[PDB]
Amino acid sequence: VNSFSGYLKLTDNVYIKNADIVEEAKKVKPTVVVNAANVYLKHGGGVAGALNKATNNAMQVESDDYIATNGPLKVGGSCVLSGHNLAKHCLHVVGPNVNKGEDIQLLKSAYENFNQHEVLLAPLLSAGIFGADPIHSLRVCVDTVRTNVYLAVFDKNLYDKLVSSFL
Numbered sequence: 428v429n430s431f432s433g434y435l436k437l438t439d440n441v442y443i444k445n446a447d448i449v450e451e452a453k454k455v456k457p458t459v460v461v462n463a464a465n466v467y468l469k470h471g472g473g474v475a476g477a478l479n480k481a482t483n484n485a486m487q488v489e490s491d492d493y494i495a496t497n498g499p500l501k502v503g504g505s506c507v508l509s510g511h512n513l514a515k516h517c518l519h520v521v522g523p524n525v526n527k528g529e530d531i532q533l534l535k536s537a538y539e540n541f542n543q544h545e546v547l548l549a550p551l552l553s554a555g556i557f558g559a560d561p562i563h564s565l566r567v568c569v570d571t572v573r574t575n576v577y578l579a580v581f582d583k584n585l586y587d588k589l590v591s592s593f594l
């Protein structure tokens with residue numbers, strides 16, 4: 428048993444809820460929250476901007492030090508950093524950005540990072556301002572992630588469409 432509440436069960440291991448991931452992280456304080464990162468860990472907008480704002484910019488300060496030491500992530504890659512006030516850890520995962528022309532096949536590689544963690548609170552990778560079809564992102568998630576993933580979908584209209592179209 429874990430502390431996640433109000434989720435619809437899609438599969439053995441994937442759960443979904445209409446929720447603000449920031450508000451969900453603050454309530455649950457999960458072991459791992461996933462950020463929809465870019466390779467520079469520049470948390471300007473979307474999920475990343477919202478998570479970073481909720482940390483009072485401490486996520487961005489830590490991220491800048493990480494990039495200064497290690498250089499950029501790979502598209503499809505990840506790093507584990509602090510979860511600050513939101514979670515124990517933040518798994519920064521880079522899905523392909525369609526609005527930059529990145530290979531959508533890299534979305535499966537992105538979701539494979541989740542398998543290194545037993546339980547995660549996450550957004551749909553490459554959705555929102557990353558430009559991919561969220562229905563596709565949910566299908567890749569279900570077909571790739573084997574660990575227990577709690578998906579937060581901000582937009583109520585999209586949530587209802589994801590549930591009602593789920594195979």
Ligand SMILES: Cc1noc(CNC(=O)c2cccc(C(=O)O)c2)n1
Pocket residue numbers: 446447448449472473474476477478480481550555556581
């Ligand atoms: C802190 C703070 N500052 O502004 C906001 C408003 N919340 C969002 O922007 C938001 C939340 C969850 C997911 C997404 C997304 O883009 O999928 C976006 N929270």
